[PDB]
Design a protein around this motif. Structure first.
Motif, PDB file in Angstrom:
ATOM      1  N   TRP A  37     -47.434  -6.597   3.711  1.00 45.13           N
ATOM      2  CA  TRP A  37     -48.631  -5.934   3.211  1.00 45.13           C
ATOM      3  C   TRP A  37     -48.288  -5.044   2.023  1.00 45.13           C
ATOM      4  O   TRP A  37     -47.209  -4.448   1.969  1.00 45.13           O
ATOM      5  CB  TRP A  37     -49.265  -5.113   4.330  1.00 45.13           C
ATOM      6  CG  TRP A  37     -50.491  -4.374   3.937  1.00 45.13           C
ATOM      7  CD1 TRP A  37     -51.720  -4.900   3.694  1.00 45.13           C
ATOM      8  CD2 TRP A  37     -50.615  -2.961   3.755  1.00 45.13           C
ATOM      9  NE1 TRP A  37     -52.605  -3.905   3.365  1.00 45.13           N
ATOM     10  CE2 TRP A  37     -51.948  -2.703   3.396  1.00 45.13           C
ATOM     11  CE3 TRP A  37     -49.725  -1.890   3.859  1.00 45.13           C
ATOM     12  CZ2 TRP A  37     -52.412  -1.421   3.138  1.00 45.13           C
ATOM     13  CZ3 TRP A  37     -50.189  -0.618   3.603  1.00 45.13           C
ATOM     14  CH2 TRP A  37     -51.519  -0.393   3.249  1.00 45.13           C
ATOM     15  N   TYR A  52     -51.523 -12.655  -2.517  1.00 47.24           N
ATOM     16  CA  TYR A  52     -52.793 -13.140  -2.004  1.00 47.24           C
ATOM     17  C   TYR A  52     -53.775 -11.986  -1.860  1.00 47.24           C
ATOM     18  O   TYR A  52     -53.383 -10.844  -1.600  1.00 47.24           O
ATOM     19  CB  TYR A  52     -52.643 -13.813  -0.634  1.00 47.24           C
ATOM     20  CG  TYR A  52     -51.570 -14.868  -0.528  1.00 47.24           C
ATOM     21  CD1 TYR A  52     -51.766 -16.141  -1.039  1.00 47.24           C
ATOM     22  CD2 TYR A  52     -50.376 -14.603   0.123  1.00 47.24           C
ATOM     23  CE1 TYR A  52     -50.793 -17.109  -0.928  1.00 47.24           C
ATOM     24  CE2 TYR A  52     -49.399 -15.566   0.239  1.00 47.24           C
ATOM     25  CZ  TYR A  52     -49.613 -16.816  -0.288  1.00 47.24           C
ATOM     26  OH  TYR A  52     -48.641 -17.779  -0.174  1.00 47.24           O
ATOM     27  N   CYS A  53     -55.058 -12.299  -2.024  1.00 48.73           N
ATOM     28  CA  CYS A  53     -56.141 -11.394  -1.669  1.00 48.73           C
ATOM     29  C   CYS A  53     -56.713 -11.826  -0.329  1.00 48.73           C
ATOM     30  O   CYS A  53     -57.012 -13.008  -0.130  1.00 48.73           O
ATOM     31  CB  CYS A  53     -57.248 -11.389  -2.723  1.00 48.73           C
ATOM     32  SG  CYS A  53     -56.713 -11.686  -4.408  1.00 48.73           S
ATOM     33  N   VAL A  54     -56.863 -10.875   0.584  1.00 50.09           N
ATOM     34  CA  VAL A  54     -57.373 -11.139   1.923  1.00 50.09           C
ATOM     35  C   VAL A  54     -58.624 -10.303   2.134  1.00 50.09           C
ATOM     36  O   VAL A  54     -58.593  -9.080   1.969  1.00 50.09           O
ATOM     37  CB  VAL A  54     -56.321 -10.826   2.999  1.00 50.09           C
ATOM     38  CG1 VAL A  54     -56.722 -11.448   4.312  1.00 50.09           C
ATOM     39  CG2 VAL A  54     -54.958 -11.326   2.567  1.00 50.09           C
ATOM     40  N   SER A  96     -61.643  -8.754   4.579  1.00 45.88           N
ATOM     41  CA  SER A  96     -61.736  -8.276   5.951  1.00 45.88           C
ATOM     42  C   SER A  96     -62.889  -7.293   6.051  1.00 45.88           C
ATOM     43  O   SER A  96     -62.939  -6.320   5.295  1.00 45.88           O
ATOM     44  CB  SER A  96     -60.433  -7.608   6.388  1.00 45.88           C
ATOM     45  OG  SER A  96     -60.121  -6.516   5.545  1.00 45.88           O
ATOM     46  N   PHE A 124     -59.243 -10.094   8.169  1.00 48.36           N
ATOM     47  CA  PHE A 124     -58.272 -11.018   7.582  1.00 48.36           C
ATOM     48  C   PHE A 124     -58.736 -12.467   7.731  1.00 48.36           C
ATOM     49  O   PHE A 124     -57.975 -13.355   8.115  1.00 48.36           O
ATOM     50  CB  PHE A 124     -56.882 -10.817   8.191  1.00 48.36           C
ATOM     51  CG  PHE A 124     -56.191  -9.572   7.720  1.00 48.36           C
ATOM     52  CD1 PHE A 124     -56.602  -8.328   8.160  1.00 48.36           C
ATOM     53  CD2 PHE A 124     -55.131  -9.648   6.836  1.00 48.36           C
ATOM     54  CE1 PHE A 124     -55.970  -7.186   7.726  1.00 48.36           C
ATOM     55  CE2 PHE A 124     -54.495  -8.510   6.398  1.00 48.36           C
ATOM     56  CZ  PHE A 124     -54.915  -7.277   6.843  1.00 48.36           C
ATOM     57  N   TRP A 169     -58.039 -16.110   3.067  1.00 51.67           N
ATOM     58  CA  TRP A 169     -56.920 -15.779   2.197  1.00 51.67           C
ATOM     59  C   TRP A 169     -57.036 -16.555   0.893  1.00 51.67           C
ATOM     60  O   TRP A 169     -57.411 -17.731   0.893  1.00 51.67           O
ATOM     61  CB  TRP A 169     -55.587 -16.104   2.872  1.00 51.67           C
ATOM     62  CG  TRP A 169     -55.238 -15.210   4.023  1.00 51.67           C
ATOM     63  CD1 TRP A 169     -56.005 -14.941   5.116  1.00 51.67           C
ATOM     64  CD2 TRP A 169     -54.023 -14.475   4.196  1.00 51.67           C
ATOM     65  NE1 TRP A 169     -55.346 -14.081   5.958  1.00 51.67           N
ATOM     66  CE2 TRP A 169     -54.125 -13.780   5.414  1.00 51.67           C
ATOM     67  CE3 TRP A 169     -52.860 -14.336   3.437  1.00 51.67           C
ATOM     68  CZ2 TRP A 169     -53.109 -12.960   5.890  1.00 51.67           C
ATOM     69  CZ3 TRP A 169     -51.855 -13.523   3.910  1.00 51.67           C
ATOM     70  CH2 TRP A 169     -51.984 -12.846   5.125  1.00 51.67           C
ATOM     71  N   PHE A 200     -51.368 -15.509  12.683  1.00 48.07           N
ATOM     72  CA  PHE A 200     -51.647 -16.296  11.491  1.00 48.07           C
ATOM     73  C   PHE A 200     -50.765 -17.535  11.468  1.00 48.07           C
ATOM     74  O   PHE A 200     -49.633 -17.519  11.960  1.00 48.07           O
ATOM     75  CB  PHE A 200     -51.388 -15.496  10.205  1.00 48.07           C
ATOM     76  CG  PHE A 200     -52.254 -14.282  10.050  1.00 48.07           C
ATOM     77  CD1 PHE A 200     -53.520 -14.385   9.512  1.00 48.07           C
ATOM     78  CD2 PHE A 200     -51.790 -13.036  10.417  1.00 48.07           C
ATOM     79  CE1 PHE A 200     -54.314 -13.271   9.359  1.00 48.07           C
ATOM     80  CE2 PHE A 200     -52.580 -11.919  10.266  1.00 48.07           C
ATOM     81  CZ  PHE A 200     -53.842 -12.038   9.737  1.00 48.07           C
ATOM     82  N   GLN A 230     -49.340 -20.612   8.706  1.00 48.02           N
ATOM     83  CA  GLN A 230     -49.167 -21.028   7.319  1.00 48.02           C
ATOM     84  C   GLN A 230     -48.542 -22.415   7.308  1.00 48.02           C
ATOM     85  O   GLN A 230     -47.384 -22.583   7.703  1.00 48.02           O
ATOM     86  CB  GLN A 230     -48.300 -20.038   6.542  1.00 48.02           C
ATOM     87  CG  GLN A 230     -47.955 -20.508   5.142  1.00 48.02           C
ATOM     88  CD  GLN A 230     -47.348 -19.414   4.291  1.00 48.02           C
ATOM     89  OE1 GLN A 230     -46.960 -18.365   4.797  1.00 48.02           O
ATOM     90  NE2 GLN A 230     -47.266 -19.655   2.990  1.00 48.02           N
ATOM     91  N   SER A 245     -51.991 -21.537   1.812  1.00 50.98           N
ATOM     92  CA  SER A 245     -52.188 -20.130   2.111  1.00 50.98           C
ATOM     93  C   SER A 245     -52.319 -19.915   3.618  1.00 50.98           C
ATOM     94  O   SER A 245     -52.805 -20.794   4.336  1.00 50.98           O
ATOM     95  CB  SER A 245     -53.435 -19.610   1.410  1.00 50.98           C
ATOM     96  OG  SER A 245     -54.528 -20.489   1.606  1.00 50.98           O
ATOM     97  N   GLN A 257     -53.717 -18.833   7.230  1.00 51.03           N
ATOM     98  CA  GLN A 257     -55.050 -18.825   7.810  1.00 51.03           C
ATOM     99  C   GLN A 257     -55.017 -18.048   9.116  1.00 51.03           C
ATOM    100  O   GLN A 257     -54.022 -18.085   9.845  1.00 51.03           O
ATOM    101  CB  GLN A 257     -55.565 -20.259   8.026  1.00 51.03           C
ATOM    102  CG  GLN A 257     -55.216 -20.884   9.366  1.00 51.03           C
ATOM    103  CD  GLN A 257     -56.265 -21.873   9.838  1.00 51.03           C
ATOM    104  OE1 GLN A 257     -57.357 -21.949   9.276  1.00 51.03           O
ATOM    105  NE2 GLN A 257     -55.936 -22.639  10.871  1.00 51.03           N
TER     106      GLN A 257
END
Ligand SMILES: CCCCCCCCCCCCC/C=C/[C@@H](O)[C@@H](N)COP(=O)(O)O
Lengths: 233, 270, 337, 219, 57, 128
Positions: free
Chosen positions: A47, A95-97, A99, A108, A111, A163, A165, A170, A172
């Protein structure tokens, strides 16, 4: 048609400045808190930054505080992250997440595609004592994730996000609490565990369920991911 | 220093009665604050009136207990604290009445239900009542004293200078004309609006009952009038002339009776 | 016409005689020796603010935590009761809202009013907002109650002599019930959702079979309009609140009224009726800005809930039975435990 | 409390701010309920399902509702219009045959348990038609209303006498039914009058002025 | 003609209603009492729960 | 159960007198206002007479004012209306109506088309 597109990157000399842009289309951008999450090559996720809804609360990781600045455009649909004095460590994929936080929501959720870039002591340390599991399709498997602190809260809700991957894709969101199932995933995946150890169970494994599984906490706000367990073959 | 200034200026049966009156004042205004057990929150302004009156009631009892004999025991600065506490409290009361008059006028000018929040005005007015009260009460202890310019000391208060005690009169005159003008134009806007609407209720108890409620502000004028005409002849008169000053305690108590009438005509008749 | 009227009168007389022939003793006589219930004191645990206009209806939901409330401001809000948080605030096309309903699964929320249209909003959307899913149109009259059988079927009661069952997908009335004479003011679904009841503005509560779409029984014991109805938790009885300042209890198995809850100090009509988890505390909201708790087996008054400054328009009880939420015309909701 | 609860609290705070802004915006428009009969011509008094009409006078916005397409029994949906500013009541005066019904309607809406606080703005339309009928023709209000024979005035005097008699008949019910909670505002408007909006504006101005006076206990 | 149709519809509805079978009122009262008595322990309004188990306070 | 039954109508020559009685049942007669309404042949319903809970307040329509009278008996729950000087215009079907709610001074939907609490009506014809 939810879509997030990342732009801004390349070869940056050390000590320079750079800007990362995220264009969002297909959803209510102004109603979603946003996170910038960085994944180093051949390493797990980490993060980086967070901007709230209405730009109320802004949070940064301990390794970027005072150097990065995260902002958003509400009349438009764009998320900006400006970095100054780049080092040799910030060479990764960003990445932009999205939420959104209310009662029973799914943080989240989506992604972005990701942009490549080539140049504490009190947070919860989360580890997974597994690096590769040789599996066979049609067989049940389990992945274990242990947390230093008990993630269970006084509300009765324990915060743990699983999550997945897939290779060249990306991440998920698979499971957005101890056991709550994210919308759209098949019923095969399940999650359980006590306040300190957690387990993800897959029944009737298929070919598409091959990749890296991450476990993340959401109790204390510096968000710590797991090392990632790789399921292959 | 106190003896020289008192003697330059020249200076049971009543004390028990005054103490009983002030006990009544403190009791009644404390009852208004309990009576806000039922909260639907202009009630803020009335509560400010009651707080100002409560501070006045405690302050005047402090003044009775101290002044009678201990005045010569006190040091000068403590004396200014003592007898500036009253200017604090009563200036706060008068400013808060001016504020409630302003609030009533402003509410009844504009075509809107009173439900419009108008949050900013409440805090601004209630802050600029107490700020003016404290600044007027705290100017003397720092400046405008008579400690060394001995010719001009006030007869009623033998250390407060005559210039400042006339400045107080000027401010009171400004307040007392502003209140009259605002309460006049509430009644006159009723007068004007009603002919165009033309309804039967004007020329009748809409408009011949607002007048009496307005005249109650004259009952406010009543008690503050004698004390301030006494505050003025001592700006005009000499130091040893006009022997009508040693009985000023009656006029101060009459101001306290205005403080008494304050919640009868504002919140009791609601 | 005279022959038909005479036949109807004779049939009504026969029905009354048959009902009287099966009434051995009143339920009050049966429960005269039942141990009473002490005075119940419920304090306002939570107060929910932010409507700025009269509240007309509310619904809890399957879980006993979330809540929905509809007002005449023009917004329908969703509350988190445990923390007094607003999950959603949905603006409405028409500001005249008379009812609201929460789906059993929690996915959808229905609303209605003077527009003679039942609007169904989808809560869990991928886009992240709340958008109108359906607009069921018809009924030629104002809507007064909506109830969800499931995510696909709804029941609506309108301001004419008509109730209807809607297939939300197609949007057409699968069945229509037409037996009333005045406005249908309330609705209550059976626990198994195979029957329901409807109280109309003609002092009549009718029991409808939701499958064949025909009236099974009609109960007439009131003297004025019926403003609220509710089933007994068992499913073999119900309670009606009318405008003659009197609640009543009717039994399906023996189509009579068992008890009447009224006092000489009450002269204003009831606007809302609910039961308890055990079906013993009948909570009735009155027009005198108060609510009353009636011992449903002894007709006594075991408590008064007085915390509202205006009419108590809506009153509901959670499925868990741990709270009672009352919403009043002063734009305030209160939870009592 | 937790990380996911402070964010929920912030979202609720934003919801509260949006709700407050919307309420403040919607509080500045006065809502009026339009009532009348079929022959009253209530549709056309102010020059420009539920009919809604928005107009502006002196930088003040007026929203007027006309509830159509509903059943005759109106004792249950009339409680919705409990917070309106005023009830505009359009009555035809040139048709004595159905004048009494109009009076009954007025009385019914004047003594309602929920419409007590709401003031009524009367509009006696077709004043020119009433004058024309009074001048020429044999149709005297004496047969419909026996009390017109002994009425004297307090255009020719006949038209004025008829107009004031009708206004008095409408105002008597308004007078002997309240204690200052609400007022009646009788007006005489033709079918081509253009000052109705100004009349409504002034009447609303003093309705809310009396409301403000009553709430601060100043009267 | 409409009045005749309404009257005959009402007659048919009354005839349909009159054919049902009704249990004794005492039996229904006893059943209601038994249900109210059986589920009394699971009603956290008739008997308040301890403050530890109260979710709202 | 809230049925009201009227009786007394018949053929009466002009200038004759008539008496209509409405025998209410199924509700407390002392809490509700009582009205007499009428419907002319091929016309709408016209409200005729009013009465209060005890008879303190009584009102009449303009057409028949001073010619009709209305009384309310509470010991035996009845509402009487007596017509003194009948006219050819006073031929209609008369109904006995009740206010929707008790202890209320207004009767809102008494004259509406379909009213729940109203009688069947009695027909009075004048001059054949
Ligand atoms: C906005 C401006 C408002 C101004 C209001 C002014 C109100 C003034 C009220 C009276 C305040 C002073 C009270 C002091 C009294 C002394 O004379 C005695 N205690 C002295 O006794 P000794 O020691 O001499 O024996």
């Amino acid at each position: 048609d939810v879509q997030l597109v990342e732009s801004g990157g390349g070869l940056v000399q050390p000590g320079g400045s750079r800007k990362l842009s995220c264009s969002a289309s297909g959803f209510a951008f102004s109603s979603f808190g946003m996170h910038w999450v960085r994944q180093a090559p051949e390493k797990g996720l980490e993060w980086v930054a967070y901007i709230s809804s209405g730009s109320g609360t802004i949070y940064y990781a301990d390794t970027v505080k005072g150097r990065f600045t995260i902002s958003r455009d509400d009349p438009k649909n764009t998320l900006f992250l400006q970095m100054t004095s780049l080092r040799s460590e910030d060479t990764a994929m960003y990445y932009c997440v999205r939420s959104i936080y209310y009662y029973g929501s799914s943080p989240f959720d989506f992604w972005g595609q990701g942009t490549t870039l080539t140049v504490g002591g009190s947070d919860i340390v989360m580890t997974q004592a597994t690096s590769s599991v040789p599996v066979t399709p049609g067989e049940s498997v389990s992945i274990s994730c242990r947390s230093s602190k008990s993630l269970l809260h006084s509300n009765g809700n324990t915060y743990l996000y699983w999550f997945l991957q897939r290779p060249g894709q990306s991440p998920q969101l698979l499971i957005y609490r101890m056991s709550n199932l994210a919308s759209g995933v098949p019923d095969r995946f399940s999650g359980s565990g006590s306040g300190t150890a957690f387990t993800l169970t897959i029944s009737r494994l298929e070919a598409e369920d091959v990749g890296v599984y991450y476990c993340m906490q959401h109790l204390e706000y510096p968000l710590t991911f797991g090392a990632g367990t790789k399921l292959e073959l | 220093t106190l003896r020289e200034h008192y003697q330059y200026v020249g200076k049971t049966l009543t004390t028990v009665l005054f103490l009983v009156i002030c006990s009544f004042i403190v009791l009644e205004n404390l009852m208004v604050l309990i009576a806000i057990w039922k909260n639907n929150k202009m009630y803020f302004f009335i509560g400010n009136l009651a707080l100002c009156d409560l501070l006045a009631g405690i302050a005047y009892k402090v003044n009775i207990l101290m002044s009678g004999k201990k005045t010569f025991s006190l040091s000068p600065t403590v004396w200014f604290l003592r007898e500036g506490s009253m200017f604090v409290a009563l200036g706060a009361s008068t400013c808060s009445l001016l504020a409630i008059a302003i609030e009533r006028h402003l509410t009844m000018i504009k075509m809107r239900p009173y439900d419009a929040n108008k949050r900013h005005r409440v805090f601004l007015l209630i802050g600029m009542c107490w700020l003016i009260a404290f600044t007027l009460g705290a100017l003397p202890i720092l400046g405008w004293n008579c400690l060394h310019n001995l010719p001009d000391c006030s007869t009623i208060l033998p250390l407060y200078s005559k210039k400042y005690i006339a400045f107080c009169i000027s401010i009171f005159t400004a307040i007392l004309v502003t209140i009259v003008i605002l309460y006049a134009r509430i009644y006159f806007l009723v007068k004007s609006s009603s002919r165009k609407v033309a309804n039967h209720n004007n020329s009748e108890r809409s408009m011949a009952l607002l007048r009496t409620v307005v005249i109650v502000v004259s009952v406010f004028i009543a008690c503050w009038s004698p004390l301030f005409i006494l505050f003025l002849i001592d700006v005009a008169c000499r130091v040893q002339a006009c022997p009508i000053l040693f009985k000023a305690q009656w006029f101060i108590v009459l101001a306290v009776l205005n403080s008494a009438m304050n919640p009868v005509i504002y919140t009791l008749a609601s | 016409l005279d022959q038909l009227r005479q036949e109807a009168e004779q049939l009504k007389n026969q029905i009354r005689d048959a009902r009287k022939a099966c009434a051995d003793a009143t339920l009050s006589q049966i429960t005269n020796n039942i141990d009473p219930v002490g005075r119940i004191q419920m304090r306002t645990r939570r107060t929910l603010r932010g409507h700025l206009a009269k509240i007309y209806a509310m619904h809890w939901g399957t879980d006993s935590r979330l809540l929905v409330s509809a007002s005449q401001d023009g917004k329908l809000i969703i509350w988190d009761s445990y923390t007094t948080n607003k999950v959603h605030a949905i603006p409405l096309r028409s500001s005249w809202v008379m009812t609201c309903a929460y789906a059993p699964s929690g996915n959808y929320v229905a609303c209605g009013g003077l527009d003679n249209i039942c609007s169904i909003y989808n809560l869990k959307t991928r886009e992240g907002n709340v958008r109108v899913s359906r607009e069921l149109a018809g009924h030629t009259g104002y809507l007064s109650c909506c109830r969800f059988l499931d995510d696909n079927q709804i029941v609506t009661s309108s301001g004419d002599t008509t109730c209807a069952l809607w297939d939300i997908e197609t949007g057409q009335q699968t069945t229509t019930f037409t037996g009333h004479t005045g406005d249908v003011m309330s609705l209550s679904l059976a626990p198994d959702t195979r029957l329901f009841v409807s109280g109309a503005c003609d002092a009549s509560a009718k029991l409808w079979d939701v499958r064949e779409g025909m009236c099974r029984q009609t109960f007439t014991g009131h003297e004025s309009d019926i403003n609220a109805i509710c089933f007994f938790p068992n499913g073999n009885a119900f309670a009606t609140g009318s405008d003659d300042a009197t609640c009543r209890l009717f039994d399906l198995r023996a189509d009579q009224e068992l008890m009447t809850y009224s006092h000489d100090n009450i002269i204003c009509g009831i606007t809302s009726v609910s039961f308890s988890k055990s079906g013993r505390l009948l909570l009735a909201g009155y027009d005198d800005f108060n609510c009353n708790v009636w011992d449903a087996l002894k007709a006594d008054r075991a408590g008064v809930l007085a915390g509202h400054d205006n009419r108590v328009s809506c009153l509901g009880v959670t499925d868990d039975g741990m709270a009672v939420a009352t919403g009043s015309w002063d734009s305030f909701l209160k939870i009592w435990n | 409390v937790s990380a996911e609860d402070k964010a929920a609290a912030e979202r609720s705070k934003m919801i509260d701010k949006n709700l407050r802004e919307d309420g403040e915006k919607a509080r500045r428009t006065l809502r009026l309920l339009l009532l009348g009969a079929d022959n009253s011509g209530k549709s056309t008094i102010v020059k420009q399902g539920i009919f809604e009409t928005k107009f502006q006078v002196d930088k003040v916005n007026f929203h007027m509702f006309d509830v159509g397409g509903q059943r005759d029994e109106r004792r249950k949906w009339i409680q919705c219009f409990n917070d309106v500013t005023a009830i505009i009541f359009v009555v035809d005066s040139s048709d004595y045959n159905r004048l009494q019904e109009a009076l009954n309607d007025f009385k019914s809406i004047w003594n309602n348990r929920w419409l007590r606080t709401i003031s009524v703005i009367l509009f006696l339309n077709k004043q020119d038609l009433l004058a024309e009928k009074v001048l020429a023709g044999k149709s005297k209000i004496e047969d419909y209303f026996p009390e017109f024979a002994r009425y004297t005035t307090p255009e020719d005097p006949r038209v004025t006498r008829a107009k004031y008699f009708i206004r008095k008949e409408f105002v008597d019910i308004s007078t002997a039914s309240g204690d200052g909670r609400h007022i009646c505002y009788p007006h005489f408007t033709c079918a081509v009058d253009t000052e109705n909006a100004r009349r409504i504006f002034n009447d609303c101005k003093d309705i809310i002025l009396q409301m403000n006076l009553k709430e601060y206990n100043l009267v | 003609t409409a009045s005749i149709a309404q009257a005959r519809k009402l007659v048919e509805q009354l005839k349909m209603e009159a054919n049902i079978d009704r249990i004794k009122v005492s039996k229904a009262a006893a059943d209601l009492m038994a249900y109210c008595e059986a589920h009394a322990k699971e009603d956290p309004l008739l008997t308040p729960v301890p403050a530890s188990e109260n979710p709202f306070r | 159960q809230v049925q009201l039954q009227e009786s007394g109508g018949g053929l009466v020559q002009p200038g004759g007198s008539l008496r209509l009685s409405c025998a209410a049942s199924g509700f407390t007669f002392s809490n509700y206002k009582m009205n007499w309404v009428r419907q002319a042949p091929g016309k709408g319903l016209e409200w005729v007479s009013d009465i209060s809970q005890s008879g303190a307040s009584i009102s009449y329509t303009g057409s028949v004012k001073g010619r009709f009278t209305i009384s309310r008996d509470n010991a035996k729950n009845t509402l009487y209306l007596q017509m003194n000087s009948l006219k050819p215009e006073d031929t209609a079907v008369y109904y006995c109506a009740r206010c929707p709610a008790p202890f209320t001074r207004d009767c809102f939907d008494v004259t509406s088309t379909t009213y729940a609490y109203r009688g069947q009506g009695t027909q009075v014809t004048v001059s054949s």
